[PDB]
Amino acid sequence: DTDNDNIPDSYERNGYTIKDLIAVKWEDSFAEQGYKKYVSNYLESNTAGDPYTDYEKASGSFDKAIKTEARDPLVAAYPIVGVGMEKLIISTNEHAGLSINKGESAYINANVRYYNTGTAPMYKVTPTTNLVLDGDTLSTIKAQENQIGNNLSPGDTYPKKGLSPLALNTMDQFSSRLIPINYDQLKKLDAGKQIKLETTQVSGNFGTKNSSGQIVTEGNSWSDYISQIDSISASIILDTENESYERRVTAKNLQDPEDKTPELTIGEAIEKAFGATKKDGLLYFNDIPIDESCVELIFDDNTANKIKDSLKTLSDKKIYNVKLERGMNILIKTPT
Amino acid sequence: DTDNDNIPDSYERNGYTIKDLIAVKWEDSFAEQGYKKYVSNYLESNTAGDPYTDYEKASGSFDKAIKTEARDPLVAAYPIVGVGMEKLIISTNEHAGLSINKGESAYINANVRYYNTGTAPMYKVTPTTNLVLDGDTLSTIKAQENQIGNNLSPGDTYPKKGLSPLALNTMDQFSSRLIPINYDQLKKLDAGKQIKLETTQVSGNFGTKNSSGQIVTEGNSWSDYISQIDSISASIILDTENESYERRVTAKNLQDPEDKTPELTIGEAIEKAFGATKKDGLLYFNDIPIDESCVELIFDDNTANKIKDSLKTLSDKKIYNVKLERGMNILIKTPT
Amino acid sequence: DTDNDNIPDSYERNGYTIKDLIAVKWEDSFAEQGYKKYVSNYLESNTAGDPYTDYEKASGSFDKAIKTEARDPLVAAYPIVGVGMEKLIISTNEHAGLSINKGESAYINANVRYYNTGTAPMYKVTPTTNLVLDGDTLSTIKAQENQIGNNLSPGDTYPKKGLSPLALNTMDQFSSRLIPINYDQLKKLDAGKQIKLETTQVSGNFGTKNSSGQIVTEGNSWSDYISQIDSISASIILDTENESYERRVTAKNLQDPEDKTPELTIGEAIEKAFGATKKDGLLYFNDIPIDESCVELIFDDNTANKIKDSLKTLSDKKIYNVKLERGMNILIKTPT
Amino acid sequence: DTDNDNIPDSYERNGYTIKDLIAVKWEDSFAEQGYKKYVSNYLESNTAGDPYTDYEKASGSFDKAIKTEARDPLVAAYPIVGVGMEKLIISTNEHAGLSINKGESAYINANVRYYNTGTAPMYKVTPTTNLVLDGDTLSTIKAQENQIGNNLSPGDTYPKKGLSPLALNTMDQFSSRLIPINYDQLKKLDAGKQIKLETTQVSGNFGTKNSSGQIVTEGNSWSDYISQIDSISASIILDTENESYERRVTAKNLQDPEDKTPELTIGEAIEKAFGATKKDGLLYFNDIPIDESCVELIFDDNTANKIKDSLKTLSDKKIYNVKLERGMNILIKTPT
Amino acid sequence: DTDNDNIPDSYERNGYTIKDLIAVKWEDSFAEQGYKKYVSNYLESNTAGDPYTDYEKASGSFDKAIKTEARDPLVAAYPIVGVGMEKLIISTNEHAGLSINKGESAYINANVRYYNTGTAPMYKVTPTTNLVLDGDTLSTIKAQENQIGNNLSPGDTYPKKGLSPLALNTMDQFSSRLIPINYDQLKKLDAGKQIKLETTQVSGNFGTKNSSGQIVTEGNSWSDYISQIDSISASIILDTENESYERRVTAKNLQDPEDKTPELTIGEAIEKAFGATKKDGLLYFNDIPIDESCVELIFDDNTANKIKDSLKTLSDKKIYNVKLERGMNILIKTPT
Amino acid sequence: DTDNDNIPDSYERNGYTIKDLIAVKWEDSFAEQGYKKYVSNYLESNTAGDPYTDYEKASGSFDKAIKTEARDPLVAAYPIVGVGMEKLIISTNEHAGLSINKGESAYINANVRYYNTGTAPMYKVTPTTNLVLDGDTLSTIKAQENQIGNNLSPGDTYPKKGLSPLALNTMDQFSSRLIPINYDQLKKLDAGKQIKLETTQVSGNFGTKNSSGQIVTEGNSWSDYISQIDSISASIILDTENESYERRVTAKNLQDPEDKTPELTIGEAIEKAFGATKKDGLLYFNDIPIDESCVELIFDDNTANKIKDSLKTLSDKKIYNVKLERGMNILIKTPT
Ligand SMILES: [Ca+2]
Ligand SMILES: [Ca+2]
Ligand SMILES: [Ca+2]
Ligand SMILES: [Ca+2]
Ligand SMILES: [Ca+2]
Ligand SMILES: [Ca+2]
Ligand SMILES: [Ca+2]
Ligand SMILES: [Ca+2]
Ligand SMILES: [Ca+2]
Ligand SMILES: [Ca+2]
Ligand SMILES: [Ca+2]
Ligand SMILES: [Ca+2]
């Protein structure tokens, strides 16, 4: 036990299961009772880089809002949130003779909705959105106390279904100083074009247990864990044309000989990340099969190049048999 | 005693009662003295996810404002509060020749009343209400120091009966910067329509004991416990046409084999949650029977589908004999 | 000694007296020296819910401003404060041609006086008062640093006799942003009606001893103890047509078999709460008798219903012999 | 072990390798498995001046976003960030007769993008940029809460590729007080010239491990480590005409006899800093050779003078065989 | 070892050297290897008054930005910083008929550059500069967050070479309230004269080691160490017509018999402070000799009087053989 | 050793000297080596009331900016600072038709210089100055962050010689809200009179040693030590027509029999406070004799009355032989 996470090294290498809050060896008969087999590394406290260790992830005492796909030590608990924008309303600043003040000529108010995907929940969201109009960033606004939405659960929005979206109209750190806009930009957008909004960063905390049996949120942050997770993991995004899922799977650096991380191919990583039931050698998700022939796979330039290099020296010419290295981005689009 | 909550595992599995602040086994003769039988899990400190453990809930030393229905370890102590709005008054901003300034053309002041349902009290309420007019969110306001109402007890309002409702007219973090509204929206609402208000989130603390014998409120929060409770519990709401009650009951995930949570049907969950006296095999609440034939039951699409699947393989065709799984939403409307 | 408040259980059940800072048994000869007999429960540190325990209350080391009626462990130390309003003065905002600005058309300044009743003193009062005019809450103002009055003793006002009342004219968290009022409301109140003011909540601290021999105020609060006291106690208010007294007496829940609280009738609760000398079987207060025949008793609907149910099965038909349960509200008006 | 960094002095002098989190001696057969040989000093906890020690750097437990070139104890982990500016937009402040207010005659809004080079990431960037126009510093602005960009990873920008740049338009500590500009400067820049922007300083924190197994960011700073690193290290910057790299390598002061730092020439420092594979005695980077003949080397006056003094007494007349002393600045431009 | 700085008293009196982080006696053969001989006092932890002790100064573990001349325990580590001002630009506040508002009639913006001399660096500079015009202090401004420059290294400026100077235009604690100026002063300075700026005080922290192996800056200050150093030390300033150097050397009070400080003449103090190589009995600095005949020496009235008293009773009539007492100010100007 | 300040009671009563940081008995031969004899009390930690004890004062480890006259335990270390005012400049607030706004009709800016006398330095001065004009206090201003001058050494000013005085023009807690003045006061002072300024109180900290070997300033204050020192000490002020000195000497209350303080006459107190060399039985200061015949002595009414009572029963009719009691104020003016 070099890593000191109450898991033996042989257990962490050859497979283990958590039963009655203790680790036991893996046998083939354990799969009939609903158990799972986990493989991790014996030189690190947390394999995936998330703030929970291997034993906390495998036992399932991190939280009760984190999905069961993040119980695997090789799958990182990481929320990916975004902002959906609509209904930009313009307030005229003319004084009634008339008085067309320039510089501060109108005001803009937007309706936003925060959406979360992934596994973990964000307990205090604070997105930073910038407004783009005709290739010109008008402003960059970080959410104030009126726009901070606590306990954004995974899979649902902060303004829930059946509720009107949030309003964003202020710029100051406190709720004052409404967003101004030039007269030239006002006359430009009144003719033909619209204003788009995009997110840049989101800051949020996570819940951790205390020594008194309670959980605590304030003091933690996700901003110091994004840089660690994104550099050692590959990103797989699946679209079912009605919902979307984004997952990060840990990979092994082949050049480093001190990285005793288990090696996963594309198919095993997909099965352990998204959550699927294997039947007749075919992944099936809930009902929709996600094999290579049935669905469409979208890569990047580097991912396609790496797959092309790793496909020339394979006995079996399948995409899912290619070794998964860090930095890959995979998109899986199911047929309609 | 794996969970370390001074309750033995056999006691926690086969039923137990708290007498003289110690746990004892359950016998059939204990029901004649007014005692209750509790079943919990032996692998978790708190079964329902509320910040009080099984022993604290069963003994009854959490607080003296929490209802006796939350003494059961399977019933979570969770307040559900809301905002009732009335009497939106409009202040004209015309200067008297006239001067109709646009952008900031009028002001709105609303009267609000905070209502609490459930079991636990919220010790420092801070609701976040947004105003909707013609499908357009005008503003989203979080309550300031003048609108924060401490010690909102369960079953009653923060402005008590015989008192005028609270006033909401400010937008800034401090008490300044009255709510503006466009001239177009002013002329729109002056003709035919009205302004609605809805709640989005409420943040509040809870009282916990200290090592000095006193209780402490500041430092705790409810926002980190909503996401844990709502993902592992089912929600039952009962209407008596004059008051409403909302309760959350813990359920068991069948796929997870490490969840040693007791299994409850619909009838047992209703009886242990709302509080009822069983007579001739019929639940009776206070006086009004709440059996399946007498009252009306309202489900959702997923709840009705799950009940339809679980009803085809039952020897007795009754709704209350269906196993209760997580995610169900049940509404019970009594006849008038 | 289960409760661990250095009081034995038999002493706490059969009666005890504190002499030389230690507890001794009660004899009939102790009443001739001016001693009192106390009964409490042996399963709780503090019976009445106030932040002082049974031994602290019985010995008399809580404070020296708390009344001797709160020395009894069954009587809670709880201040009830209120605001008396007068002399609303209106400031015109017309600019002299004239200029009648709407929205912010005048200002209001009120004179307030904080009054305290009960036993304990409030060490830092901060009342929250709302102004009602023609059934319309104009504003809700929480007292700022200029309106916070420390060490409000029981039985007297914060602006003492011979001093002009406090002034309330600001709305902002700091001393700025004077209270505005519409032109319509100004012309409405200038004709026939007046503006009333009511209190909604008051936040205040209490003094507790430290380990260094000093007392400390900042850090404590009364807002977390109102919800506990008001749910387990009955309220008795006595009027002598010149002063008023409000007291809370602890009661026993009959359905709960783990509540080992002593049972008190109406007469014993009145005698132990308000403070009276028994002579010829008649309570006498200071000089004015407060028996059922001499004075007038006012109940509520629930209190009268409970008394009617509990009066049909009594051998002696007297009001003071009825068992006192929680939730009762009693008013005692002495004849003039 | 004088320095107390669990590394023996003979190990730290003659070469060592970290295997299974313990230090072992270096043999020639270890290079075939992918291992590296490290040399450090035995009188200091951290040789390069970065906040991580020799054992933390050599083992590789500092962070997972730091590049593998900073695993060497002689290479300092140090981010170098900068600001790229574009799209200065001017807002007129004329009131429409006209009204040309002087002093505050227009406003300027800039679009900025933060770029990071080096090894370590900056976890909370706060650049300080000043605007120069016609040799006149108009203003110096430090980034506010809307312009602070957390977790700026090495090798990429804070507004990532495919996103519009950040907006800078405020001057006050809070988001208010837009940037003013004189009428003379407005008429000066409207004719022929443009406004440039430059960075002056950047403040940022770094992530360090805690005793609870988590990492912490707030409390640390980079501003107290720049002065230590820059005085004892030489700077080498390499340009590949599409990306740039900047590295700092520790050097030895020859006059100080208590500096037991290993001596490195130019070639060894380049190979250990930038990261290169030696083949046939030639450095090759990724594919592009970076030998003295193939690429162009740019020095300063002091660097060229020191190389000229150290080149007259060399048996082999090569640039890479010159001893590297502190204060040198080297630029390596690859051919196109 | 009375002073408890792990240095023996005989070692501290007769000379010592730090080798392998331990103190050893001084021999004449140690000068051939590059070692130095130090003399200090045995009754004080730090002889010079700087926040580093004798052992920390002699070993060289204080910091790596402090010059090697401050390694001597008799030379205090003390930065002397100043502000160089240029390019005062005037902003007219006339409104265009015209409108010449008095009191606030124009604005002034200055360009400043912070320069550091001495040994230690200032880690957070905050200079306090006042503006003088025609013998009238217009304003006194302390630098805000936009004008605070961290890690000002010794020997170089905060806006480095090749960068435009810092801008100073605000007066408020936050970045607001631009500097006003009277119309009389505006018309006075527009005719013939200019505005000068001078520094009054500078506040800055210093870096010290922690128990966790890191260094910490916030919490320390230089303002409590200026008064101690300046009262017990003499100041020597040397000018080479292109750079300037300022040093403080500790002196001994002759009247106090409990001051066991070593006695230094002018020549030994100059050699140990500025740093010089002795050759043929002549100081030589880098190359320029700084003997009494070659260069010009400038004193004050008190310094010249003390030298005149101490020169009448000397066997050898040289300036450098005069005993150096506290309070002396010496200027050394090299020939051009 | 009752007082526990590592000084024996017989040593503290019969005289003692601090040599090699330990206390030794006094002999007549110790005066030839430059030593001093100290007498203190054995029932108090600090005799004079200053925050340094008897051993700290006698040894000389308090600070290095405190004068040697405060090394005596009977002389309190106490700075007396003041403000010298000049150059009140008036800014007109007329708008140019004209516009003479009343209430806020002009502005005043003063030039101030802080001077320190006594022994100890004030490390963060914050004087509170009020402006008097025609017997009317215009305003009372406490110094803000721009006017706070750290490390005010004894004997010199905060704006040193050769520097322009500080500017005072603001009134708000932050640097805003310039000082207004009425039109009536403006026309009153423009004719014949001037505005005077006086100090009322000054708040400042002092430096004390820490357990880590450093000194700390923030957290201490002088405001809690003025009331203790001024009630038990007599004040002697000496004028040499070019500088002034103010000292406080501890006295003994004759009525209290528990005050074991040594008794001092006027001459011994003057010699031990101001610092003088006794020659031929005559005090001589530096060169100017300060005997009763040569210089002029100025008392108050109470001081002259006490001297008249204590002079009738003296064998030798000299002023310096009168016992010095607390509350006396003595002024010593040397001839010109
Ligand atoms: Ca392990
Ligand atoms: Ca592990
Ligand atoms: Ca248990
Ligand atoms: Ca349990
Ligand atoms: Ca007890
Ligand atoms: Ca008790
Ligand atoms: Ca070592
Ligand atoms: Ca080392
Ligand atoms: Ca020593
Ligand atoms: Ca020493
Ligand atoms: Ca003593
Ligand atoms: Ca003493």
Residue numbers in the entry:
A (entry chain A), B (entry chain G), C (entry chain F), D (entry chain B), E (entry chain C), F (entry chain D): 220 to 315, 378 to 617
Any passages from the paper?
CDT is a member of the Iota family of protein toxins which also consists of two homologous toxins produced by Clostridium perfringens (the Iota toxin) and Clostridium spiroforme (C. spiroforme Transferase, CST). All three Iota toxin family members are assembled from two polypeptide chains termed the “A” subunit (CDTa, Ia, and CSTa) and “B”, subunit (CDTb, Ib, and CSTb). All three B subunits are presumed to contain five domains that are involved in regulation (D1), oligomerization (D2 and D3), and host recognition (D3’ and D4). Once proteolyzed, the mature form of CDTb forms a large heptameric, soluble structure referred to as the prepore which binds one molecule of CDTa to generate the toxic moiety, CDT.
Still, maps of modest global resolution could be reconstructed for the CDTb dimer (3.74 Å), trimer (4.08 Å), tetramer (4.08 Å), and symmetric heptamer (3.27 Å) which enabled map refinement and model construction. Similarly, the number of symmetric particles in this dataset were not equal, with the heptameric structure ~44-fold more abundant than the octameric form. Although the unique pathway we describe for CDT also results in the formation of heptameric and octameric structures, the octameric structures are present at a significantly lower abundance in vitro when compared to that observed for anthrax toxin in a cellular model (~1.5% and ~30% in CDT and anthrax toxin, respectively). Conversely, the particles isolated in fraction five retained a high molecular weight, suggesting the symmetric heptamer does not spontaneously disassemble upon dilution. Indeed, residues 456–463 of CDTb remain unengaged and dynamic in the structures we describe here but interface in the symmetric heptamer. Our observation that small oligomeric intermediates, but not the assembled symmetric structures, spontaneously assemble and disassemble would support this hypothesis.
